A paper describes a structure:
Here we report a cryo-EM analysis of GrpE bound to an intact Mtb DnaK, revealing an asymmetric 1:2 DnaK−GrpE complex. We went on to derive a cryo-EM map of the DnaK−GrpE complex at an average resolution of 3.7 Å. The structure of the intact complex reveals that one molecule of DnaK binds asymmetrically to a GrpE dimer, with DnaK NBD and SBD straddling across the GrpE dimer. The Mtb DnaK adopts a disjoined conformation in which the NBD and SBD are separated with no direct interactions, and the α-lid is in a closed state. Therefore, the DnaK–GrpE complex is likely in a post-reaction state in which both ADP and substrate have been released and the SBD lid becomes partially flexible. There are three significant contact regions between DnaK and the GrpE dimer. We observed in the consensus structure that the Mtb GrpE β-sheet domain wedges between the DnaK NBD subdomains IB and IIB, thereby widening the nucleotide-binding pocket to facilitate the nucleotide exchange. Therefore, rather than being locked in a static open DnaK NBD conformation for nucleotide exchange, the Mtb DnaK−GrpE complex undergoes a series of defined motions that are centered around and coupled with the ratcheting of the GrpE dimer.
The molecular chaperone DnaK is essential for viability of Mycobacterium tuberculosis (Mtb). DnaK is assisted by DnaJ (Hsp40 in eukaryotes, a J-domain containing cochaperone) and GrpE, a nucleotide exchange factor (NEF).
Residue numbers in the entry:
A (entry chain D): 3 to 159, 162 to 184, 186 to 261, 265 to 513
B (entry chain E): 44 to 155, 160 to 187
C (entry chain F): 45 to 134
The structure:
């Protein structure tokens, strides 16, 4: 029910709550980020996203591109209308996201948290809330992007000190927040005309200048060539957060002999042409440091927010503004804000905490089967209070008793896994293998206490074990099992035993 | 006591109000085993064509400029498009048709009244019923 | 008449019911999500079967040295570069 919406000046991501977790709902055409170019049609049929943007490159004056750049101020136009109200333009993409939340299985997404930049105002919050309520979506939290990102990464406590570096893509925002018993923010300030689109335009301009050097073609009126160059530059920029040696080659720009544009754009040149944009960050960070009592080491954690923060220059600047501290990872920077909004929406209306999700993962749970192999019953991260079933059978003809051992350790080889206990069931009448069915269940409660019981479906013989050793393991050693299991990823020897089971039947 | 009984009643009511909600959500997600099961995977089908669309357009403008109207590479392009046709390649934005915003990525507006494509600078491409990339069309 | 024991038993039972149901929900939300990615193998399909023949044709053309020109040398390299990520070699 809860929805996490990150409205933006350039992009917009929506994420609904699937129980206790947020998931970023893909839009109509597969993507997640809906390009927030809320452009009206030739006649009436309002479009949002790429269906609206494609009608904007041709029709410049039939389109509102960015609305988050204006709050309260009437950045309004009219299209067969009469002074259409401003925030309703973003209410249109909000309505699109509410409709598109049904792309994942939903019924009525009527609760959502909308996010706003750190640079805030009573007018800005009121405008976003009015747009939300016009869009038909009840909203109670309008959390700032910094704190929303911090919640997304997980900060709900000592006296935390979270730093935020919102590269944005079109707008910039940096702030330091001290997370204590309440959500706390001190003072925010940053660039408003600066974003990754400036890096894109800078590489576009570099390519244009290089082609003007290599040939006399103006490359300022060949609109098809302009789209080719812009797409190539954006692709190169996104790819530049890898393979520091980069090049692009657009096949057909313009001919009379087909001219072959080709440049080996290097990230060295990227910095050489974007250093002014990068150094525009220094003033906001020094300003937010000096506004209150802050030291370079006073920052506890920093989070990278905003699209296209993967640029090495920005990460270097962040780690040279505080020290060799690494930021938080796990959630994609273009969608951290929506994840945070969804988590906050869940928290507000009572969907997290309680006794739910306090259980996280009982590491490993399984029973060893014949042949040095273990049959998994409860998956590695499966929430602790589970229930399972399995119909096993005696491995030998006329077997009087069957012994089943419970083991933990995701490794397929139970010899290296830790022994927990053994329970043997007797009273089995002598019968050939295949017909008997032995039911095995893993019963586990909130505290982590395990129950493994085996019952004979054929007759009724039942034996029980109470190993209870799943809990109490040291948390430091738990992370070592992750590496132990992941190192031996290519472990398919169990298929040999599975084939060897061919003797039966 | 009375206060303890009231607190216990409140806890019972809260747990009851949560149990049916989580059960209903679990059923709703169980419904997804056949609804979006192929959609998320077929996003990979969309990707394995979204990557090749650039090469397809490059070949298209190679044929348009006559540098590759014939030749072995023209045959290579023919084989590629013929093979991909089985997957559902239905090129849109054909010359002389109506301008569809949901299907066409119009860039240049040479003439400011039914909108129509002046020229397909880049032919739009499709994979079954999934609109992949809007056709680059010069609306006139 | 107080039924305090009955209410405590109901508390101890409904809590376990909530826990079991949420665990089933999470287990199946991981299960079906695992099929969401197991079906990527089916999504692979014969796309490579249709790309590898094209790659082989352009490579056989390249063996004669034709792919040494100017603008003619762009398409094959672009196709190979895009294919290598989402396709196997000849």
């Amino acid at each position: 029910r809860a929805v996490g919406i990150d409205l933006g000046t350039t992009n917009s991501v929506v994420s609904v709550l699937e129980g206790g977790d947020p998931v970023v709902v893909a839009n109509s055409e597969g993507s997640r980020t809906t390009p927030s170019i809320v452009a009206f049609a030739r006649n009436g049929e309002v479009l949002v996203g790429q269906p609206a943007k494609n009608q904007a490159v041709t029709n410049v004056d039939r389109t509102v591109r960015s609305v988050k750049r204006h709050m309260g101020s009437d950045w309004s136009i009219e299209i067969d209308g009469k002074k259409y109200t401003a925030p309703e333009i973003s209410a249109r993409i909000l309505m699109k996201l509410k409709r598109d939340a049904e792309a994942y299985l939903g019924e009525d997404i009527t609760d959502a948290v909308i996010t706003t930049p750190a640079y805030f105002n009573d007018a800005q919050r009121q405008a976003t809330k009015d747009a939300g309520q016009i869009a038909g979506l009840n909203v109670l939290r309008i959390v700032n992007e910094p704190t929303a990102a911090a919640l997304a990464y997980g900060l709900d406590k000592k006296e935390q000190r979270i730093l935020v570096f919102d590269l944005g893509g079109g707008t910039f925002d940096v702030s330091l927040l001290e997370i204590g018993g309440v959500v706390e923010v001190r003072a925010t300030s940053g660039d408003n005309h600066l974003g990754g689109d400036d890096w894109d335009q800078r590489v576009v301009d570099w390519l244009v200048d290089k082609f003007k050097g290599t040939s006399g073609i103006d490359l300022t009126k060949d609109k098809m060539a302009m789209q080719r160059l812009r797409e190539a530059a954006e692709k190169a920029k996104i790819e530049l957060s890898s393979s520091q040696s980069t090049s692009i080659n657009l096949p057909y720009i313009t001919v009379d002999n087909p001219l072959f544009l080709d440049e080996q754009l290097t990230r060295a040149e990227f910095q050489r042409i974007t250093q002014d944009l990068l150094d525009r960050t220094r003033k906001p960070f020094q300003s937010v440091i000096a506004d209150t009592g802050i030291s370079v080491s006073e920052i506890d954690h920093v989070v990278l927010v905003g699209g296209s923060t993967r640029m090495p220059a920005v990460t270097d600047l962040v780690k040279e503004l505080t020290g060799g501290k690494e930021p938080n990872k796990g959630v994609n920077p273009d969608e951290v804000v929506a994840v945070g909004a969804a988590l906050q929406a869940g928290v507000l209306k009572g969907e997290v905490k309680d006794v739910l999700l306090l259980d996280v993962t009982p590491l490993s749970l399984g029973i060893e089967t014949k042949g040095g192999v273990m049959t998994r019953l409860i998956e590695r991260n499966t929430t602790i209070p589970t229930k399972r079933s399995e119909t096993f059978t005696t491995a030998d003809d006329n077997q009087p008793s069957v012994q089943i051992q419970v083991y933990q350790g995701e490794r397929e080889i139970a010899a290296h896994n830790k022994l927990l206990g053994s329970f043997e069931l007797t009273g089995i009448p002598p019968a050939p293998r295949g017909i008997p069915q032995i039911e095995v269940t893993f019963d586990i409660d909130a505290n982590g206490i395990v129950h493994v019981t085996a019952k004979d479906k054929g007759t009724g013989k039942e034996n029980t074990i109470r190993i209870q050793e799943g809990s109490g393991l040291s948390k430091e050693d738990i992370d070592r099992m992750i590496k132990d299991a992941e190192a031996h990823a290519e472990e398919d020897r169990k298929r040999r035993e599975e084939a060897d089971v061919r003797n039966q039947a | 006591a009375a206060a303890d009984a009231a607190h216990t009643e409140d806890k019972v009511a809260e747990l009851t109000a949560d149990l049916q909600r989580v059960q209903a959500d679990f059923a709703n997600y169980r419904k997804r085993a056949l609804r979006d099961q192929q959609a998320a995977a077929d996003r990979a089908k969309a990707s394995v064509v979204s990557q090749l669309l650039g090469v397809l357009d490059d070949l298209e403008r190679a044929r348009k400029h006559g540098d590759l109207e014939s030749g072995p590479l023209k045959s290579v392009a023919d084989k590629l498009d013929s093979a991909l046709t089985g997957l559902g390649l239905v090129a849109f934005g054909a010359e002389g048709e109506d301008f569809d915003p949901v299907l066409h990525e119009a860039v240049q507006h040479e003439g400011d009244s039914k909108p129509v494509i002046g020229t397909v600078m880049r032919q739009g491409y499709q994979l079954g019923e999934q609109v992949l990339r809007h056709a680059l069309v010069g609306v006139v």
